[PDB]
Amino acid sequence: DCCLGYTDRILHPKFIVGFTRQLANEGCDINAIIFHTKKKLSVCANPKQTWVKYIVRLLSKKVKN
């Protein structure tokens, strides 16, 4: 459903297969990055955190290449 809290975890860049962005803007109350992982589970993350931004850029660069 909507993320209400953010993980304390710091994910490995190779453990994620993608992500979704949740905006306070659409149905949910807060903004979140939802990482989709190789365990076919999703992890809710703080959009402002340096690791979250970094993983997302590593993934999109991989696609660019």
Picked from ligand SO3, a second copy, none, the partner binding residue 14 (CB below 5 to 8 A depending on kind) is none
- Are 1 and 8 a contacting pair, CB within 8 Å? no
Is 57 among the residues that bind a second copy (CB under 8 A)? yes
> Residue from 12, 13, 29, 38 that binds a second copy (CB under 8 A)?
38
Residues that bind ligand SO3 (CB under 6 A): 7, 9-11, 17, 21-24, 26-29, 31, 33, 43, 45, 47, 52, 55, 63
